[PDB]
Structure formats: C-alpha cells, structure tokens
Amino acid sequence: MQKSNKINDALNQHYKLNVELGLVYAHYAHVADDEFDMPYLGKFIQHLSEDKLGVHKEYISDYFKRNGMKLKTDVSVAVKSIPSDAKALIQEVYARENEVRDHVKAIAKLALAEDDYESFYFIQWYVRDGLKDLTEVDDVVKLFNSSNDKLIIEETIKEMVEKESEHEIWG
C-alpha cells in the first residue's frame, strides 16, 4: 500500500492552488466592496475565499496524514492588476473555478491510472465541489447580464449569501 508519488505531487499542487486562490479571492472581496461599492458581492467572494483556504486545503493535509504522503507548503502569489469592474471581477472568479474543474479532472484520471482507489474516492469530493462552486459563481455572473442596476444586483446577492442547503447530488 505504498503511496503514489504522482498523486502526492498532484495533490500538493492542488493544495497550493487552493491557498493562492483563497488569497486572491480575499483581495477580490476587498475590492468588490471597497472600489466597486458592492458589499454583498464582497461577502460572496469572501466566503469562497474562506472555502478555499479552509476545507479545500485542510482535507488534503488530513488525507496526507492518513496515507504517508508528504505535505509541501510553497506559496507565491501577488495581485498585480484588478479587473476593471464588478462584472469582470466575477467573470475572473468564474474562469479560475473553471480551471479548478480541469485540475481536479486530471487528478481523478491519474488516480485510476495508478490504481489508487483511496485517492479516487478522496477526490470525488473535489469532483462534486468543482461543479457546485462553479454553479454558485455562475449564478452571480448571470446577474450582471440581467440588470444594469448595481443595487438591484446587490439585493439579489444578499439573498444568495443569506440563504440557509444541499442538493442530493451536488451538495
């Protein structure tokens, strides 16, 4: 039952991605509120930031504890430009979440190629969450095409953030 080095490498990279994404989202949350005057968009993006810096990274470190894989912490990220408006801000968040689905798909494929069924089981959470997170971000992108009034958009985001739930399949 020796751990896969390739999976170890791919999951360390995914740990890194979730840390750096979380740090960028925290900046984007500040910017949505501070410069675009959209505090509820900020809260939406802040929750996603805390999601990436929270369970997304912690489940990997916990997995590594269980199977002998080695954790690496190697983090480099700088927010050097900002999208020009709130719509492009959330569209960028959408693009990054779409890349998450792509990275996660590669890990699922690699786990089967390695006959690492514990890792294929483990990554199912991330397969499900890749689509759930994208859907939630997509629900906010839509609003900027449905109204030209920032305060109307903000009121619709407020409900989304303040909604209490889980889809049977997508969580």
56 by Cβ neighbours in 10 Å (0-12 / 13-18 / 19+) ranks as buried
Site for a second copy contains 124 (CB under 8 A): yes
User: What's the min distance (Å) between Cβ of 52 and a second copy?
Assistant: 11
With beta carbons less than 8 A apart as the criterion, state whether 117 and 67 touch: no
- What is the footprint of a second copy within residues 143-162 (CB under 8 A)? 143, 145-156
Stretch in the footprint of Fe ion (CB under 5 A) among 95-103, 105-113, 119-127, 128-136:
128-136
With beta carbons less than 8 A apart as the criterion, state whether 87 and 21 touch: no
By a kind-dependent CB cut-off of 5 to 8 A, residue 57 interacts, out of Fe ion, Cl ion, a second copy, none, with a second copy
CA dist., res. 44 & res. 13, Å (int):
25
The residue from 7, 53, 89, 90 that contacts a second copy (CB under 8 A) is 53
Q: Which phi and psi angles does 30 have, rounded to 5°?
A: -55, -50
CA dist., res. 167 & res. 135, Å (int):
12
By a kind-dependent CB cut-off of 5 to 8 A, residue 95 interacts, out of a second copy, Fe ion, Cl ion, none, with Cl ion
- What is the footprint of Cl ion within residues 92-111 (CB under 5 A)? 95, 98, 109-110
- What is the footprint of a second copy within residues 73-112 (CB under 8 A)? 73-79, 98, 101-102, 104-105, 108-109, 112
